[model samples]
Target: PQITLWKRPLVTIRIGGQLKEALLNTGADDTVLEEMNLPGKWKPKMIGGIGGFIKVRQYDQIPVEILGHKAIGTVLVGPTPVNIIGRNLLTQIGMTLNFPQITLWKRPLVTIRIGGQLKEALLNTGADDTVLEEMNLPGKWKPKMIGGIGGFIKVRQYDQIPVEILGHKAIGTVLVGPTPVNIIGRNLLTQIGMTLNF
Candidate 1:
């Protein structure tokens, strides 16, 4: 199954014989649920997110099923505004991570150079294509995408653009669109030796 990250990466999952929608948060380190009605050894713990922190019941060895993939592990249930599938369980299910110091997954911004112009681009492995905010500097090439901008917009795909990531150079097709910030997509990340680590 394809997991699409549209600013907020979300998916539906089944846990403890109940179905609910959850955010596929690569920045999160643990699975968090909004409520509790499951069988498992529970522990009281504090969890944090974009809205800050909250008290939750952390359940261990609970079964979770998503898109037919099954995993049994720790799941926190409490006042979670949104049910989240963090990278901790994500790695077990063959996925990855995201975020910053205050966040677990969701905020990944890095310095990147596209066609010699340096700018801050989000390291969005969840995005299907690399998006360039302004393509004025880059010459003679363009791209378009099905998602990530304006609910579906067309742009130029530049195939000869040289992208530099932390001093690593990899040239590939880059999509251009009206975005406030740029994004480093998985197309070039795979070439530059970047992967999910949490």
Candidate 2:
């Protein structure tokens, strides 16, 4: 399936004899489903997201069908706003979200070069803006705010900067902030000619 960024990359999934819509979230590490009734022995676990951490019921080896592809893995049941088919299950499905390039679900990792420096970044289709871990980028920048599933954070927005991702160069806005990980968002992704395919 060739997926575009015009909307959320959502797909139908069958789990526990129920059909539901789940987002193919490349950013999430584990799969999370909304609170539901599933007959199984689960353990208590805590998972953190953009907002904060929450306790959830961890069910192991659950059979799930994503758009007819079979997969069995651990699923977290909690108060998630939406069902997320994360990397844990996506890797087993053997597919790629391509930008005319093969990006395996196992961490869409890419090498990025900016300000004459190199860093490893995640090609995050889920994010709208590019954010790098706290770093000193030489040039004029403006203070701005960006929010995610967690909360808002202040960052230095550097505009019209050239960044190289997988040897592809594009000039765009890059944010320098205290982020948990370096993210390559849609703003930069589109410039590099990326699209989702499964």
Candidate 3:
């Protein structure tokens, strides 16, 4: 059997006031921030795994900066062998992974405007689409169940929502879930012209 390997740029993130370097993994299905760097006050929650649900903690939005762009959002903190820049953050900004050149480029995308607040989201080449937390969603959008590994997951689908990236505005779907971080999945990445930065 042949195995395919994908890689992307490695960037540094400041978590809990500490600096850590992690690989920008577009292949990751979710955005996972390590627990070691996570700050106190963030509590752990049960997460559904392949075998069963496991307890994992979710952290408040910590400051994150890549190349120059920065955003604050919730992150998952827990025990893991390696740290990764999951699809959540990667998808917010439009990124291209050039495998040959080993560089990740921040492309332009539509800006997101919520409650008159303009926010930039990355278009993750690795993620299937974007996932938003139920609490962060605008208005009193009721949460609904969407299929997932765990039992029924709560989610909401928004169409043509404004998303600003690098000062550009674009519309896309945002899925609201219990998790704090927003995920940019493969579904959105393919729509835009982007290749893996690795």
Candidate 4:
């Protein structure tokens, strides 16, 4: 399969009052940030992988705003090559990836208004399903076994999660899964009238 690439201007996020730019990648399923770039106090968690698990040494809650939409969530620090914008952030804003134009569209199903702001999410066709970082989900949400590409994976079920994008508020299901994070998959895309553009 040919993976589609959607690149946008580097968006800056504030961590402990510091600013950094992150590259938006529609191809990535998760949002990945650097440990060195994180600020303040954080507790590291042990993340398991197909090979085993790695001890993540640092984490922090940062404010992330994209295309004028903003949210606060905890982020894990990693040695990954670059800071990535993944599914969690995208779904928070109602957005669809326009592959041909390489732009994110503000559409329904993923778009909503919260606190007088229209928030639009970015739809990622590369993802298999909509996903949110485990830490980002609210209480009362837990993981469930679901079929995945590599056999079975865990996901959280939320009937109506409040997401703010581009100053709009939208309600949709939020799935909690393994993180690092980015989103758009069969679930949201099919819910909205969007198809992959070659």
Which number leads on TM-score? 2
lDDT order, best first, reads: 2, 1, 3, 4
Quickly count the clashes in candidate 1: 13
Candidate 2 lDDT trough over 10 residues, lowest sum: 97-106
Q: What are the lDDT scores of the predictions, listed in order?
A: 0.65, 0.83, 0.51, 0.50
Kindly report which residue stretches of model 2 are placed more than 4 angstroms away from their true locations once superposed: 50-52, 100-105, 138-145
Clashes of 2: 2
TM-score of each: 0.52, 0.82, 0.41, 0.39
Candidate 3: list runs displaced more than 4 Å. 1-8, 48-54, 96-194
Question: For residue 70, what is the lDDT in candidate 4?
Answer: 75
* TM-score of candidate 3 on Cα atoms, chains taken together: 0.41
How many angstroms is residue 125 displaced in model 1 relative to the true structure, after the best TM-score fit?
1.2
Task: Write candidate 2's Cα lDDT for 1-198 as tens digits.
Answer: 777765667899999999999888787888999999887899999987654577889999999998778999999999887788888888778656776566554678889999889999988766778899888889999999887544578899999999999888889999998888899888888888787766
Give the best candidate by lDDT: 2
Q: Can you give the lDDT of residue 144 in candidate 3?
A: 55
Clashing pairs in 2: 50-150, 51-150
Give the true-structure RMSD of model 1. 8.9
Which of candidates 2 and 3 reaches a greater TM-score?
2
Root-mean-square deviation per candidate: 8.9, 2.7, 11.8, 13.1
Q: What's the alpha carbon RMSD for model 2?
A: 2.7
**Runs in model 1 lying further than 4 Å from the true structure:** 1-13, 16-106, 148-150
Positional deviation of 50 in candidate 4, in angstroms?
10
Question: Per-residue lDDT of 1-198 in model 1, one digit per residue for the tens?
Answer: 344333445667999888888766544567888776988568899865322467888888888986567878889888765677776567567664322222233455678877657788776554556777756654676444444211355667777678887777878878776655577776776667665432
